[PDB]
Amino acid sequence: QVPTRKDYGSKVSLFSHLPQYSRQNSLTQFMSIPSSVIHPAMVRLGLQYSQGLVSGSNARCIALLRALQQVIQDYTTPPNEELSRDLVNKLKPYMSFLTQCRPLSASMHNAIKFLNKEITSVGSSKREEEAKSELRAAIDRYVQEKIVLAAQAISRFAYQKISNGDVILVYGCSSLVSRILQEAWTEGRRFRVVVVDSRPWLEGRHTLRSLVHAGVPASYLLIPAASYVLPEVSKVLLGAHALLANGSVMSRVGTAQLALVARAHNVPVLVCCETYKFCERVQTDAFVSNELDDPDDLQCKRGEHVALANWQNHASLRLLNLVYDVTPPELVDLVITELGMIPCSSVPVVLRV
Amino acid sequence: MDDKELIEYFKSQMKEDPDMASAVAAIRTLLEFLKRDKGETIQGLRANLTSAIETLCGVDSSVAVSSGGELFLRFISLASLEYSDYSKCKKIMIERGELFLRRISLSRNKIADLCHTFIKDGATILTHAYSRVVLRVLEAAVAAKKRFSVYVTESQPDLSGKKMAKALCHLNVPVTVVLDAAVGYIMEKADLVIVGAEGVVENGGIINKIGTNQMAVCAKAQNKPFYVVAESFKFVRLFPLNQQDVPDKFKYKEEHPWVDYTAPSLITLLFTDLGVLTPSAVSDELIKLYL
Amino acid sequence: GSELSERIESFVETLKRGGGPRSSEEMARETLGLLRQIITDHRWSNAGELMELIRREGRRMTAAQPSETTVGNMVRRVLKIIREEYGRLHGYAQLQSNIIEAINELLVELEGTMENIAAQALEHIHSNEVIMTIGFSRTVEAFLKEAARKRKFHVIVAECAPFCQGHEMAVNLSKAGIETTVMTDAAIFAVMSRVNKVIIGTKTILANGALRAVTGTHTLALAAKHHSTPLIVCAPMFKLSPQFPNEEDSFHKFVAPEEVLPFTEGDILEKVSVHCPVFDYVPPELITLFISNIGGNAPSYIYRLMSELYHPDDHVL
Amino acid sequence: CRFYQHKFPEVEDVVMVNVRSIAEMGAYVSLLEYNNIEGMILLSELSRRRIRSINKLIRIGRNECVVVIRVDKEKGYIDLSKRRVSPEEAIKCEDKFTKSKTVYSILRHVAEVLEYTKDEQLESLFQRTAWVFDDKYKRPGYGAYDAFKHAVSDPSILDSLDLNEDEREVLINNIN
DSSP, X not given: OOOOOOOOSOOOGGGTTSOOOOSSSOGGGGSOSSOSSSOHHHHHHHHHHHTTSOOSXXXXXXXXXXXXXXXXXXXXXXXXXXXXXXXXXXXXXXXXXXXHHSOOOHHHHHHHHHHHHHHHHOOSSSOHHHHHHHHHHHHXXXXXXXXXHHHHHHHHHHGGGOOTTOOOBOOTTOHHHHHHHHHHTTTSOOOOBBOEEOXXXXXXXXXXXXXXXXXXXXXXEEGGXXXXXXXXXXXXXXXXXXXXXXXXXXXXXXXXXXXXXXXXXXXXXXXXXXXXXXXXXXXXXXXXXXXXOOGGGOOOOBTTBOTTSSSSXXXXXXXXXXXXXXXXXXXXXXXXXXXXXXXXXXXXXXXTO | OOHHHHHHHHHHHHHHOSSSOHHHHHHHHHHHHHTTOOOSOSHHHHHHHHHHHHHHHHHOOSHHHHHHHHHHHHHHTOSOOOOSSSSHHHHHHHXXXXXXXXXXXXXXXXXXXXXGGGSOSSEEEEEOSOOHHHHHHHHHHHHTTOOEEEEEOOOTTSOOHHHHHHHHHTTOOOEEOOOTTOTTTGGGGOSEEEEEOSOBOTTSOBEEETTHHHHHHHHHHTTOOEEEEOOTTOBOOOXXXXXXXXXXXXXXXXXOOXXXXXXXXXXXXXXXXXXXXXXXXXXXXXXXXXX | OHHHHHHHHHHHHHHHTOOOXXXXXXXXXXXXXXXXXXXXXXXXXXXXXXXXXXXXXXXXXXXHSTTOOHHHHHHHHHHHHHHHHHHHTTOXXXXXXXXXXXXXXXHHHHTTHHHXXXXXXXXXXXXXXXXXXXXXXXXXXXXXXXXXXTOOOEEEEEEOSSSXXXXXXXHHGGGGSOOEXXXXXGGHHHHHTTOSEEEEOOSEEOTTSOEEEESSOHHHHHHHHHSOOOEEEEOOGGGBOSOOSOSTTOOSOBOOTTTTSOGGGOGGGGTOOOOOBOEEEOOGGGOOEEEETTEEEOTTHHHHHHHHSSOGGGGGX | OOSOOSSSOOTTOOEEEEOOOOOSSEEEEEEOTTSSOEEEEEOOTTTGGGGGOTTTTOSSSOEEEEOOSEEETTTTEEEOOSSSOOHHHHHHHHHHHHHHHHHHHHHHXXXXXXXXXXXXXXXXXXXXXXXXXXXXXXXXXXXXXXXXXXXXXXXXXXXXXXXXXHHHHHHHHHTO
């Protein structure tokens, strides 16, 4: 089937059960060149998941759905097989390939679960190509009316909670918040923005540029100085990777601590998320479900010396950097979604049904 | 027809009786307006109701009346119409309105016999304002023969808490009209807090007379319980995050507000005619009540 | 016919005093057996008549020992089921057998809630950890020696004082190689700084997550609100009740004062008004995460579940 | 322009409307059967179950059939529905909608060769030409379509009421 990627050196004692992956030793070194054992769309999409060319959540979900559509409408039926079975069996190894390449988010898992429900929902009364086009149009209509129309409704809602004068705090390359701002700024409301980024995957700069190029006065500053600007900040507008069952909004590694000092200075947090980033497992602390991207990139060029050149030759040393933290539902005060505005401790009683 | 007598009839009814709350008089005025509609449409009524609501939001600004109008206009169009001749619609809609106003009327009685089991006999009710629902809660808490001392803060913007104190000691309860500035003091000896409610925002904390929020946090200071009683039609879909976020048509009516917001992390339980709710449940039942 | 009444009286009596059925599973199970017996071996024209009858018998069964509501919530759920079947057959002929098959479904689910919780366990624990419980519930010991056969954590159980009940667990779990440490309840806080999470049982989950557990846990809920270590409440879904916390505080179970101050003490028992409650109330806000045979949940989902199972009208039972 | 020379739509008629908003008591959407009428398709019982409708702004734009359950054009009141229509009326309404689309497109592209001074010129030209043709075809709505479809045989079908040279020019240019 598919080989397995190596572990990159020492993990954290508490996080041994999680993978210490590496974004250099890509799997595609040892596959079939004119990919047949693997689809071309899957080898390509995984290969560009390992090269970071897809970062956000909506971005990963859309890239996944596009590559899966390219798999679908380039697939013929083996002898005497109903689509509902052979297709999902064809799908499983590709999803395992992706999960081997870059551990899937909640958006990828939501899309995969929906796509399994759809592949199995196709019938025997429908011919091959007609029902294949049906599933194709189903993927398309979902990826439209549950993410893009979603974000537009999120804008129509959030526009209410941005009055004239109040600055706003955000975090990193969460596409939804940039759209919220560049959509509620044209309609008149005026404000500022205080983007906040971290290391070494510095990713506030993306929303920074997308805010500069929209006429919105920004101001960028690393998160070990967030405690500074929180006096002024009147709303925090976090991008919410994945809601959870209890209400604990999992998001990027800063979101939690940011909401912490935010509630400390008593500024009302607002995480923005859509009604499909709701993988309904639960995760009490921040450790029972995370990842670990290539940690060997934390280092920084400092004059002539980089303090971690020989990362490994210091045995008892180990590095890490999570890629997901979690805000418990005490801190957060808004879940803006296409259902309206719901308090964070009431995520499940309205998103389970 | 027009406000020229609609508003006058509204004021006359709402001021015929103090136990008659405000927004229920608003509902009754909307109903009599329907009973004097003289028109042929439904759309024009989905607009004329909003017209009456916007001429009602001036004579009264309390969240009560906006909630009543919006929720009533919502629920009235719930039993699928499939219009016949703009008359079957009339009968079924006035029937829905009659049923809704009767639900409204018995809301207070239901919340009365649902609340009275919470004053642990020999305790200290600490109310905050003349509030018909808290009044007819304490009445059914002394009718079931418990005993309790009641501290009614005075609500400085208008010394009306004294009205609650008088009408309450009319029922032979040990009343003590504290200084509304002293809600940091008597909170050492308040076994529970029963504040009247004038509308609930989504997340659970409520809009209430100015001196509520402080009292609210004082509760959470000294780990006392904080109990509210929101009549059934006191739900609105705002969602403030700080006392300035609430609409300006609500607060005012030098610079000093009249109502303000108690965050939900302070309220321990809510008592509505929809039962007993931890605030998350009021978010849920507000979404699924407006529908 | 009279066999009905005799097993009713046997049940009521062994309820008032009888130690055992031990696991609340077993209490609910024999309750369900008695429910089946009542609901097949009696006379009723309409279904509402059976609603009224079983309401009477449940009222007696609960007002017998109101300190235990597993039987009460079982009665309320059975009343929900009769409401369901009457609604289905109204919008009368053989609905009896429909009742019985739904009850058999309920019972086969009940018989496996423990393994549901077991399978859900391992997604919350990982090695190099220390976990703290209190008292003794069969659910928690299943949980722990289930998660034990994959990895070896360090459990710290705090023996309750009114009964060294936790002691038993600390023996049982010591029979899975699980690093059990027994501490005296008083010393909870003394080690509360090195307990990564707590796993507490219950005997009720009131209608706002305000569980009511074995005594010596409100202190645990507060010492884990303090350190912000989380409360895994391992409460099988059938332990709920639509009752709310502030109700007349005949709420604990005031066991005989011989547990605390033995009778052989002496004269000082003239005016020493000893006390002994075995149920500590716990408030919602301290409760972090509920487990149940459905999955994981938040103390705000409990009202959804209560409006789900027990038809909100029969809370008065 | 106004695709029908009648004052208001017909009683128990069938029109196609573009769902725009999702209001409280009914979707306040717009159609064109009487120069962009504004109807309120009343939300039903299990249709009001949109309380959990993913992106309740759905139907932001889409065509859908609606029958005029009640009407009073004294000020522009129309109350539609969505459960009184069936695939027969649905197919017929699709037919009438396609016909109105083609007719309006042809007529607008034709009168576009004149750059009318004001909308009153559009109304007068439409009235005269299309209304005369449809009334001669002994059917309201089924007249201009049949006329523009028979103009594929001889563009002087109704040359007795000869409208103008630019009309026949553009018509035989980009219709037949």
